[PDB]
RNA sequence: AAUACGUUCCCGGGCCUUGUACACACCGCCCGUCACACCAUGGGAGUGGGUUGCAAAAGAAGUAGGUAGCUUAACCUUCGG
């Protein structure tokens, strides 16, 4: 437990920036392409957050080619580079499940602006 | 030797006439089922395409309307905007 915690936390990336379920987040990832080693980007919107320390996770979901592709990170991995917010959403709840039943018009977030 | 009134009836034939789908001409012509082969076609549980009405759903790019957020060399500035 502080043997854990103390394992956890030498671990745990210092500079996660703030972010927020409906937010629209752009996520830098280490990826083998072939031969290459090269960042990618993977943008959406956060539906899902796991705050649990070097555990803490969250889902990005984003259309591709008409149909939903979602991704769960772990925060702390070393494959994830970088994290940054597009754009702030306004949501009242924690897990946005409900948007995987929208599309297009409906699945829009207003932004918060403040 | 017998017998013949007579021509209604049988058979062959002649002339006039009539009907005919016959003309290798009534031993003529021709009809439908059935059997066999071929052709095209209709129906047929269905099978596969084209086009189309109605009821809704969808909403890329563009253009126009609105515009709190972000951003801005030329004009205004009392230099803050
Ligand atoms: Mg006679
Ligand atoms: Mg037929």
């Known amino acids: 437990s502080n043997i854990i915690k103390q394992l956890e936390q030498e671990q745990m990336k210092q500079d996660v920036p703030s972010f927020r379920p409906g937010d629209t987040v752009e996520v830098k990832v280490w990826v083998v392409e072939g031969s290459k080693k090269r960042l990618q980007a993977f943008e959406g919107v956060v539906i899902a957050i796991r705050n649990r320390?070097?555990?803490?996770?969250?889902?990005?979901?984003?259309?591709?080619?008409?149909?939903?592709?979602?991704?769960?990170?772990?925060?702390?991995?070393?494959?994830?580079?970088?994290?940054?917010?597009?754009?702030?959403?306004?949501?009242?709840?924690?897990?946005?499940?409900?948007?995987?039943?929208?599309?297009?018009?409906?699945?829009?977030?207003?932004?918060?602006?403040?």
């Open 53 to 114: 320390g070097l555990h803490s996770a969250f889902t990005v979901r984003k259309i591709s080619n008409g149909e939903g592709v979602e991704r769960v990170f772990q925060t702390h991995s070393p494959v994830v580079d970088s994290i940054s917010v597009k754009r702030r959403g306004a949501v009242r709840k924690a897990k946005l499940y409900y948007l995987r039943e929208r599309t297009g018009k409906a699945a829009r977030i207003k932004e918060r602006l403040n």
